[PDB]
Write a protein that binds this ligand. Structure first.
Ligand SMILES: Nc1nc2c(ncn2[C@@H]2O[C@H](COP(=O)(O)OP(=O)(O)OP(=O)(O)O)[C@@H](O)[C@H]2O)c(=O)[nH]1
Ligand SMILES: [Mg+2]
Ligand SMILES: [Mg+2]
Ligand SMILES: [Mg+2]
Ligand SMILES: [Mg+2]
Ligand SMILES: [Mg+2]
Ligand SMILES: [Mg+2]
Ligand SMILES: [Mg+2]
Ligand SMILES: [Mg+2]
Ligand SMILES: [Mg+2]
Ligand SMILES: [Mg+2]
Ligand SMILES: [Mg+2]
Ligand SMILES: [Mg+2]
Ligand SMILES: [Mg+2]
Ligand SMILES: [Mg+2]
Ligand SMILES: [Mg+2]
Ligand SMILES: [Mg+2]
Ligand SMILES: [Mg+2]
Ligand SMILES: [Mg+2]
Ligand SMILES: [Mg+2]
Ligand SMILES: [Mg+2]
Ligand SMILES: [Mg+2]
Ligand SMILES: [Mg+2]
Ligand SMILES: [Mg+2]
Ligand SMILES: [Mg+2]
Ligand SMILES: [Mg+2]
Ligand SMILES: [Mg+2]
Ligand SMILES: [Mg+2]
Ligand SMILES: [Mg+2]
Lengths: 148, 275, 166, 140, 97, 94, 101
RNA sequence: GAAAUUGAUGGCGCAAUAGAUAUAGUACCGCAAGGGAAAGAUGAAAAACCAAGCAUAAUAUAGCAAGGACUAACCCCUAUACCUUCUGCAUAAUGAAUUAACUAGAAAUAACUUUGCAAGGAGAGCCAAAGCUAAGACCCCCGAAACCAGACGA
RNA sequence: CCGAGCCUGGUGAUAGCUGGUUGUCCAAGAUAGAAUCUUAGUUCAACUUUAAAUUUGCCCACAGAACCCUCUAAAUCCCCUU
RNA sequence: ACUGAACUCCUCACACCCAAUUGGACCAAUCUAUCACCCUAUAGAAGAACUAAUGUUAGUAUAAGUAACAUGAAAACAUUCU
RNA sequence: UCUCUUACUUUUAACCAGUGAAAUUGACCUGCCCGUGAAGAGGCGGGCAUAACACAGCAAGACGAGAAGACCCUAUGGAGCU
């Protein structure tokens, strides 16, 4: 629930779009296993997709480590310092591809409730409303019931 | 005892997590941790920033003098990034000055200098480097990298970009990664000033305008503990600006700040930067 | 059972640099399996919390509760070991940073009632813990003044934002 | 005890993690925590409708405030903007009222203009020329 | 607290001990040996359920019939009572009738 | 004070209910809609004799499609590829 | 929905847009364009030759897990579902007006 | 519910609330028959972080104690615990102090699905006018007042 | 703790009666009566569920369905087309 | 005229709100056969899952530091006194 | 006894010190009025009230605790007696 979970505001890592888009994902470590049905999909991904993904995203370093593993994993490190570890255990090639693409397209900011669907650093162009807007001014600035 | 291993393994992992949370480990540079390759990381840095860095220049920019001294000491028991950092700092200062002067021709030289100092300061540059991964590729003799070393490395990277791609590409890089840091910031949030009324009086004297006259445009709850005072500065019986405040003096000071912003062309509703 | 309080006296800090504030000495002492209710012990503990060693001893010497004598003995032992082993220069330069009572191991007995019925007595035992910190007792937290309280209110007023909009 | 449950710790924790922020024993005891957590999740599910309803109510209240500042009632403003064929919704209208007071004054002036054009048409019922702002752009 | 705080001692299973290695051998003794021996004759265990299967009531009836005379006194009393209870349960209780 | 005996809206002594101008207007609006419905239903295009059998072919073909769907219910095919693909669970590297 | 937008603004659209991150887009349905001194209103939409709003697909993400809980007392009716909604964050780069009034 | 007749080498067990009641038929209970427990955990050598409950740290107007939220814990708005039973329960109908552990759907006939073989199937017996063989699926826990037999008791 | 003792055993007595009946998710699902020492229950029917075979299912145009009774309700059944 | 649902539209997605009962897809943990080797996979099995039975056992709470309980007096602690 | 109760002593009681239960207990952040409703509200609707806490009394309510109501009915449930 929102009250039982942290929250943040919509934001970008370094104003990611103003000048140029910078892919926030920087590292992808795939822990895979030679043997083990859990990492069959991971093995197929390494064989058939990882090269294409690497060349499509030249700004992401991919570390494929084949060691004995019961739960193959993918650790995504983002420019902002966030680390997201996802299990690719018993996931088909398509599922692994979608997960990896989502990690690539996703920023390092925490996946928590976002308070507002929008964020403006300049919400007002004409002047934020204050009680004295839309209020006429009186001669010599005389408050009501003032004698002189 | 309940026969089984998987529940015990899960509990052991959770106990490890709790232990780590209770006693966090000291920070360690990303180089030490597994899954690291300096050449791949630096090439990815260049490609990610979308710039054809020359690898030798980028490596020289990332290597710092303190790292050289520490490595020599360890050897007892490499070209630093000084020149690249100097070139990058000089170019960044000049290019930011050009951008700011073109965008705000009315801003005074002191204001432009203060804005450039803010953009090239330790805080902003350190933040940009940290979120651009300059720190990870930075070779230093202590971790976390101190802000001074991080700033020097970032400007060395800018200098390497200048030597590789050229002034135009470097200017685009600066516009994208340092000018953007002034978005949402306020003129006097970036350029700290004292006696804005004095500054405004001086500017109006230079512009040949009669000295401003403070005038209580609006007020609310004067005798209460939460007053509002809208004080306007009138020159020749013409409103140049008006500012709110809690006390009359604070309102006058804020009105002076508003007038300075309007004169220098750094109003909140000013034309957004063109990227 | 747990005996971490005793172990807390065996932690050795690394030598301090010359340009570092002198670390106040900390002495952990306790008495286990006191024939006393932890609820009753807690009042004495709370009474002596935050006071100098001498003030705590003076207060306990003139308290009619049984636990007062036990706490006084524990405090005297803590002072003695602080001077002898923990390199505390002055006896009186110690204050009770922590004083609490904990449940001990209790025995179950039977209380006979009027109609062949009974209740389960608990021969209650309690632990007592003290941490003595070298240096003068920290000053009591001053009551917040009208000025500070109004300052807090004005800060709350200023923190207001236009909620649920751009 | 051929087969026994060994995960019950984690099964309890999956519920208690969402109750850690409750009050009293509901944040410690599973028998109570599970009930409170089920109620909390049901409330969270049902609260989205109320979130939307309260957002619209807040927007209506703020638009009413701004229109009253400009001398118009909320029904008048909304109906006359619709008749002018401006399809700004209540969220945007409240945002304009707050952050673009001059734009909201312009919109209120337009609404009053259309309202008076409608009154004039009703009074001079007939084939009199349509109001300048009353003309409707046709689409095909 | 119903969870152990230490990993259980590692359990090593010899997948190639004699029993596992030769498991299943002579299961086709009949078809591959001119049907001189039925595979059910390879079953070593209680005499009353060698090459025979049934529910609890049938198993108890067979046990009493085949080895009841050789059972201990209290064990035979328990078997008789179990047969009685199972008879009542299976012939008088259940959802379907 | 001011109790309605028993349960409101059900008993002999119910809470009085009064029609508001809003409710009257709503009912009148619905009545107007239904009057227009009567008008538009009062003008048939074809007569019964003219319509007789004019959709028989389409209706019969639709029922034929339904019958074909009902009678084409049969177990799905089974392929050797599906059975043999399970061997891939132990597919390993070299 | 209708968004009040300005240059450098961020917008969270509650779905995937089938666009690669960092790709530039034109928001074509602009109802209002406003400045400090003047505002232009569409009937109901402003002209393409009048307004050009451009955005960039900064991020594609999944929303935080949302709990859908159904419960009815005294009916053994309890159900739980966790749903993550696709989302795209867009940064509005420029709002350009042209003299075509 | 027959008979003739036929022929006949350990553990996909428990592991201290489990498995024998059992560390013991001991302690304890009863005149007696009889009933009947609980529990221990270091090390090669002792001749070496996690249940409930509390404490750290009592408490602030208002309300099934949460949710929407919020800059902000509360303040704002929404919200009549759960289970069983019932036509209908917030119900002032039942149960529940709470934590840990234990504690409750057994199966034939005929069908259905999947194989094998096929006018035959089945490793004698049995079935067969596409059947037959094999497998899969398929039916709870606690509770009386009672009745009878044999002992033990004035 | 005697309207007939206590213990053990038959005994896990029986209970149409009360209570309880423990992972996730989706779907269909409230519907006439008869008999019964039977109305606190059960069998059949009706309804409900699943799978399968087949072709008509519902809505419904005329025409049509009683006198007793002098008159007499909303309607109903049947029913091609659609 | 406006307000006003989970109705309808809108952008994206859709198996994802009826008791008893019924159909189906998944699945925690345990063991066994082969895998796997920082926790697993395909299958075969079964004492296979507890917010509830005035449930059983154990722990600790609430009532509660409450109801209740106790030592005749002085003294040299010899003794005396009531 | 009462009109008509009063005074005192002891116990009890309250405070200090030691020792220290029992029933009960869904969770409680535990207000009043009127109305509502499973037909008598602390929790629902409309109002009113409302800093937080101990200690001592009271017994109007929490349909208060206690005993799965002894009354009454039912059960093809028992038993005693005629
Ligand atoms: N099924 C079963 N086999 C047993 C049992 N006791 C012993 N055996 C088997 O008896 C065989 C011989 O037992 P060992 O102890 O090796 O030798 P042993 O002492 O000569 O054996 P015995 O003559 O049976 O006493 C082995 O195959 C054992 O597995 C038992 O209780 N059950
Ligand atoms: Mg007690
Ligand atoms: Mg009523
Ligand atoms: Mg025979
Ligand atoms: Mg035992
Ligand atoms: Mg705890
Ligand atoms: Mg109740
Ligand atoms: Mg009842
Ligand atoms: Mg109770
Ligand atoms: Mg005698
Ligand atoms: Mg007796
Ligand atoms: Mg029974
Ligand atoms: Mg349904
Ligand atoms: Mg609405
Ligand atoms: Mg079980
Ligand atoms: Mg439990
Ligand atoms: Mg229980
Ligand atoms: Mg107590
Ligand atoms: Mg009391
Ligand atoms: Mg007393
Ligand atoms: Mg006392
Ligand atoms: Mg009432
Ligand atoms: Mg009181
Ligand atoms: Mg009393
Ligand atoms: Mg109540
Ligand atoms: Mg009572
Ligand atoms: Mg009763
Ligand atoms: Mg009677
Ligand atoms: Mg009878």
């Amino acid at each position: 629930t929102a009250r039982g979970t942290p929250s943040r505001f919509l934001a970008s890592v370094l104003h990611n779009g103003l000048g140029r888009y910078v892919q926030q994902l920087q590292r992808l470590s795939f822990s895979v296993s030679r043997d083990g049905a859990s990492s069959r999909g991971a093995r197929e991904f390494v064989e058939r997709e990882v090269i294409d993904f690497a060349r499509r995203n030249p700004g992401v370093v991919i570390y494929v480590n084949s060691r004995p593993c019961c739960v193959p994993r993918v650790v995504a490190e983002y420019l902002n310092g966030a680390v997201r570890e996802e299990s690719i255990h018993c996931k088909s090639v398509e599922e692994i591809s979608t997960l990896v693409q989502k990690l690539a397209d996703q920023s390092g900011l925490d996946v928590i409730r976002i308070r507002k669907p929008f964020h403006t650093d300049n919400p007002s162009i004409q002047g934020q409303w204050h009680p004295f807007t839309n209020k006429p001014t009186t001669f010599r600035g005389l408050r009501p019931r003032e004698v002189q | 005892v309940k026969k089984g291993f998987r529940a015990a393994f899960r509990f052991q992992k959770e106990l490890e997590r709790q232990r780590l949370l209770r006693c966090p480990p000291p920070p360690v540079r990303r180089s030490e941790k597994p899954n690291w390759d300096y050449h791949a990381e630096i090439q990815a840095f260049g490609h990610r920033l979308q710039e054809n860095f020359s690898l030798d220049l980028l490596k020289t920019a990332f290597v710092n003098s303190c790292y050289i001294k520490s490595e020599e000491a360890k050897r007892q028991q490499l070209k630093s990034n000084q020149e690249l950092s100097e070139q990058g700092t000089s170019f960044s200062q000049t290019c930011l000055t050009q951008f700011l002067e073109d965008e705000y021709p009315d801003m005074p030289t002191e204001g432009i200098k203060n804005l450039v100092d803010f953009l090239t300061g330790e805080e902003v540059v350190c933040h940009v480097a940290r979120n651009l991964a300059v720190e990870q590729l930075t070779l230093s003799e202590e971790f976390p990298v101190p802000p001074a070393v991080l700033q020097q490395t970032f400007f060395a990277v800018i200098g390497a970009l200048l030597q590789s791609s050229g002034p135009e590409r470097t200017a685009l890089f600066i516009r994208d990664f340092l000018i953007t840091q002034m978005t949402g910031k306020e003129l006097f949030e970036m350029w700290k000033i004292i006696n804005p009324m004095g500054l405004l009086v001086e500017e109006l004297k230079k512009r040949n305008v009669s000295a401003p006259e403070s005038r209580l445009t609006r007020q609310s709850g004067g005798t209460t503990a939460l007053p509002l005072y809208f004080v306007g500065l009138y020159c020749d019986k013409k409103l140049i600006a008006e500012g709110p405040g809690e006390t009359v003096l604070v309102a006058e000071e804020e009105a002076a700040r508003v007038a300075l912003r309007k004169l220098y062309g750094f109003t909140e509703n000013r034309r957004p930067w063109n990227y | 059972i747990s005996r971490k309080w005793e172990k807390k006296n065996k932690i050795v800090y690394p030598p301090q640099l010359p340009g570092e504030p002198r670390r106040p000495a900390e002495i952990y002492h306790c008495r286990r399996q006191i024939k006393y209710s932890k609820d009753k012990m807690w009042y004495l503990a709370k009474l002596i919390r935050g006071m100098s060693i001498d003030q705590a001893l003076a207060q306990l010497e003139f308290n009619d509760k049984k636990g007062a004598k036990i706490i006084k003995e524990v405090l005297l032992e803590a002072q003695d070991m602080a001077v002898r082993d923990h390199n505390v220069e002055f006896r009186s330069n110690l204050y009770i940073a922590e004083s609490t009572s904990g449940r001990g191991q209790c025995l179950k007995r039977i209380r006979y009632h009027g109609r062949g019925r009974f209740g389960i007595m608990e021969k209650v035992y309690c632990h007592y813990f003290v941490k003595l910190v070298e240096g003068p007792p920290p000053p009591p937290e001053p009551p917040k003044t009208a000025v500070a309280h109004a300052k807090e209110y004005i800060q709350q007023l200023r923190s207001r934002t236009i909620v649920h909009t751009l | 005890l051929r087969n026994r449950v060994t995960d019950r710790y984690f099964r309890i924790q999956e519920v208690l993690k969402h109750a850690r922020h409750f009050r009293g024993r509901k944040n410690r005891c599973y028998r109570l925590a599970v009930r409170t957590v089920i109620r909390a999740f049901v409330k969270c599910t049902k609260a989205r409708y109320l979130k939307k309803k309260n957002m619209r109510t807040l927007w209506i209240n703020r638009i009413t405030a701004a229109s009253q500042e400009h001398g118009l009632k909320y029904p008048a403003l909304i109906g006359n903007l619709v008749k002018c064929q401006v399809e700004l919704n209540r969220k945007v209208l409240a945002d304009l009222a707050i952050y673009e007071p001059k734009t909201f004054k312009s919109l209120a002036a337009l609404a009053s203009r259309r309202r008076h054009e409608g009154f004039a048409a009703a009074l001079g019922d007939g084939k009199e020329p349509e109001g300048i702002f009353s003309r409707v752009v046709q689409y095909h | 607290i119903g969870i152990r705080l230490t990993l259980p001692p590692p359990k090593v299973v010899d997948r190639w001990n004699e029993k596992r290695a030769m498991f299943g051998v002579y299961d086709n003794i009949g078809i591959l040996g001119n049907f001189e021996k039925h595979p059910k004759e390879l079953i070593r265990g209680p005499i009353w359920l060698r090459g025979w299967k049934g529910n609890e009531l049938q198993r108890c009836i067979r046990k009493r019939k085949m080895v009841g005379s050789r059972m201990f006194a209290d064990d035979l009393h328990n078997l008789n009572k179990r047969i009685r209870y199972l008879y009542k349960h299976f012939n008088r209780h259940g959802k379907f009738r | 004070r001011g109790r309605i005996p028993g349960r409101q809206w059900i008993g002999k002594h119910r809470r009085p209910r009064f029609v508001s101008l809003r409710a009257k207007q709503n009912m009148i609006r619905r009545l107007e809609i239904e009057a227009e419905n009567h008008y538009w239903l009062s003008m048939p295009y074809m007569t019964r004799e003219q319509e007789r059998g004019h959709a028989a072919v389409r209706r019969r073909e639709a029922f034929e499609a339904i019958k074909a769907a009902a009678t084409s219910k049969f177990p799905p095919h089974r392929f050797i590829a599906d059975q043999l693909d399970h061997l891939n669970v132990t597919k390993k590297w070299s | 929905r209708q968004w009040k937008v300005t240059s450098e603004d961020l917008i969270l659209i509650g779905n995937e847009l089938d666009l690669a991150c960092g790709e530039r887009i034109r928001l074509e349905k602009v109802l209002l364009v406003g400045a400090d001194n003047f505002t232009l209103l569409g009937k109901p939409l402003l002209g393409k030759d009048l307004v050009r709003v451009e955005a960039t697909v900064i991020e594609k993400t999944e929303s935080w897990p949302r709990i859908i809980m159904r419960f009815r007392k005294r009916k053994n009716f309890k159900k739980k579902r966790i749903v993550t909604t696709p989302q795209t964050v867009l940064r509005i780069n420029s709002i350009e007006i042209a003299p075509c009034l």
